[PDB]
Amino acid sequence: AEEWYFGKITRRESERLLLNPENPRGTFLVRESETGAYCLSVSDFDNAKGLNVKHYKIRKLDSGGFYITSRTQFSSLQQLVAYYSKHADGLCHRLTNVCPT
């Protein structure tokens, strides 16, 4: 899908969008790594930080496969988004809602 792909948006810009108070815990967006890789940014919550954002670097295997953890890989970013919206499996929270605006 292209809806959760925000492209060349910076890390602080994605945080300002994800920190939106109407956003359900687990709101996300995929963007290009600021530092040719991609990044999954997810909104989270805890009492110390309150509303916050987690950033995961989406890496690629040399055999062609996207990954974030060590036991799961995908053929596309859409397959990765789909898997993580069903299971958190290592992520702070599972993907629940595509980031607004």
Encoded tokens for 75: 């053929």
**Long-range Cβ contacts of 11-16 (<8 Å, 24+ apart):** 11/39, 11/41, 11/55, 14/39, 14/41, 14/53, 14/99, 15/41, 15/53
In the complex with Cl ion, the residue whose CB is nearer, 9 or 81, is: 9
**Smallest distance from the beta carbon of 19 to Cl ion, in angstroms?**
17
Residues that bind Cl ion (CB under 5 A): 33-35, 57
To the nearest whole angstrom, how small is the minimum distance from the Cβ of residue 10 to Cl ion? 9
Q: What is the DSSP string of 16-58?
A: HHHT-TTSPTTEEEEEE-----EEEEEEEEETTTEEEEEEEEE
Provide the minimum distance between the beta carbon of 60 and Cl ion in the complex, in angstroms, as a whole number. Answer: 14
CB nearer to Cl ion: give 24 or 32. 32
Task: Give whichever of 35 and 47 is closer to Cl ion, judged by the CB atom.
Answer: 35
State which residue, 10 or 76, has the beta carbon closest to Cl ion: 10
